[PDB]
Design an enzyme around this catalytic site. Sequence first.
Site, PDB file in Angstrom:
ATOM      1  N   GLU A  32      13.880   0.628  -3.964  1.00 37.59           N
ATOM      2  CA  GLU A  32      12.207   0.153  -3.524  1.00 37.59           C
ATOM      3  C   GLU A  32      12.981  -1.826  -4.197  1.00 37.59           C
ATOM      4  O   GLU A  32      13.421  -1.864  -5.766  1.00 37.59           O
ATOM      5  CB  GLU A  32      11.603   0.324  -4.401  1.00 37.59           C
ATOM      6  CG  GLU A  32      10.456  -0.069  -5.051  1.00 37.59           C
ATOM      7  CD  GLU A  32       9.148  -0.723  -3.941  1.00 37.59           C
ATOM      8  OE1 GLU A  32       9.495  -0.285  -2.696  1.00 37.59           O
ATOM      9  OE2 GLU A  32       9.378  -1.868  -3.593  1.00 37.59           O
TER      10      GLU A  32
ATOM     11  N   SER B 232       1.362   4.251   2.357  1.00 35.21           N
ATOM     12  CA  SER B 232       0.528   4.547   3.698  1.00 35.21           C
ATOM     13  C   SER B 232      -0.140   5.468   3.741  1.00 35.21           C
ATOM     14  O   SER B 232      -0.742   6.265   2.824  1.00 35.21           O
ATOM     15  CB  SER B 232       2.090   5.131   3.878  1.00 35.21           C
ATOM     16  OG  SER B 232       2.893   4.126   4.326  1.00 35.21           O
TER      17      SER B 232
ATOM     18  N   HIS C   9       2.376   9.474   6.545  1.00 29.43           N
ATOM     19  CA  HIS C   9       3.674  10.073   5.591  1.00 29.43           C
ATOM     20  C   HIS C   9       3.949  11.431   6.895  1.00 29.43           C
ATOM     21  O   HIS C   9       5.229  11.263   7.060  1.00 29.43           O
ATOM     22  CB  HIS C   9       2.804  11.030   4.327  1.00 29.43           C
ATOM     23  CG  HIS C   9       3.158  10.001   3.110  1.00 29.43           C
ATOM     24  ND1 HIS C   9       2.118   9.244   1.856  1.00 29.43           N
ATOM     25  CD2 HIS C   9       3.876   8.628   3.377  1.00 29.43           C
ATOM     26  CE1 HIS C   9       2.273   8.538   1.544  1.00 29.43           C
ATOM     27  NE2 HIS C   9       3.008   7.554   2.301  1.00 29.43           N
TER      28      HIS C   9
ATOM     29  N   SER D 201       5.452   3.980  -3.357  1.00 30.84           N
ATOM     30  CA  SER D 201       4.152   5.367  -4.456  1.00 30.84           C
ATOM     31  C   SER D 201       5.558   6.290  -5.079  1.00 30.84           C
ATOM     32  O   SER D 201       5.363   6.721  -6.092  1.00 30.84           O
ATOM     33  CB  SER D 201       3.235   5.256  -4.118  1.00 30.84           C
ATOM     34  OG  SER D 201       3.974   6.237  -3.279  1.00 30.84           O
TER      35      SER D 201
ATOM     36  N   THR E 208       0.810  -1.310   0.116  1.00 25.62           N
ATOM     37  CA  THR E 208       0.276   0.179   0.295  1.00 25.62           C
ATOM     38  C   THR E 208       1.763   1.532  -0.274  1.00 25.62           C
ATOM     39  O   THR E 208       1.854   1.308   0.451  1.00 25.62           O
ATOM     40  CB  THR E 208      -1.116   0.020   1.476  1.00 25.62           C
ATOM     41  OG1 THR E 208      -0.246  -0.021   2.417  1.00 25.62           O
ATOM     42  CG2 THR E 208      -1.770  -1.194   1.381  1.00 25.62           C
TER      43      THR E 208
END
Length: 218
Positions: A108, A54, A59, A83, A52
């Site tokens: 990532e 967040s 954040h 993301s 997901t």
Amino acid sequence: ENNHKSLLENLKRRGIIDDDDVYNTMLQVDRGKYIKEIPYIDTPVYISHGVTISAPHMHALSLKRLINVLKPGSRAIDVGSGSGYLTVCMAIKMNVLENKNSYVIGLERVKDLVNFSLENIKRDKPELLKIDNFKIIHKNIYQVNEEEKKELGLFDAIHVGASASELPEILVDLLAENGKLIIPIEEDYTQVLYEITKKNGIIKDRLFDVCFVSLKKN
Ligand SMILES: Nc1ncnc2c1ncn2[C@@H]1O[C@H](CSCC[C@H](N)C(=O)O)[C@@H](O)[C@H]1O
């Protein structure tokens, strides 16, 4: 009628944002450019691969803890950039566009998420993928050998957006003097958000219980 700015105003009313620099930074980064489904609801929103983006409060809270080490001229790393939402927030706060000494890197582990974040950034701030001092890398933090470790240098701010079974020592080694590391660590039956600082060579600060996706070792 949901919009990015009203989201940020809701977090302020709820006292989740209590900092102008947290506000102004997030204001510069529209969440809807980073997730398509219900982009302004304060909840995590599924992307792909078990991950997901967040919740906005997560954040906001992480950005708050790092606000004073996210300085232009400094070096930040977003571990589990996902993301790329928070990575762009770091690029903005540190002015990687005008300040050549500022450096921001997202790592990532999942390639689809690398490509997802790079597409988000193209549509939001394409100028970020033209520069030398902002990057999103396909990389697992646990697969960073001595060579790349030396090459990465030291970081004034380390954000880790995934929970670790224990405090990875690499992140401790990547940390600069006076730098802050924000990381969830599994502590018995919770994930606990920690703020770790270096003041000669580490002071561990137990913040509160959190819910994050796992920082996967393979
Ligand atoms: N060992 C590891 N090294 C690098 N990234 C990892 C990792 N383990 C998990 N991740 C990544 O960590 C991310 C955490 S969820 C995404 C958080 C991100 N800051 C956002 O709000 O979009 C996931 O994208 C997951 O793929």
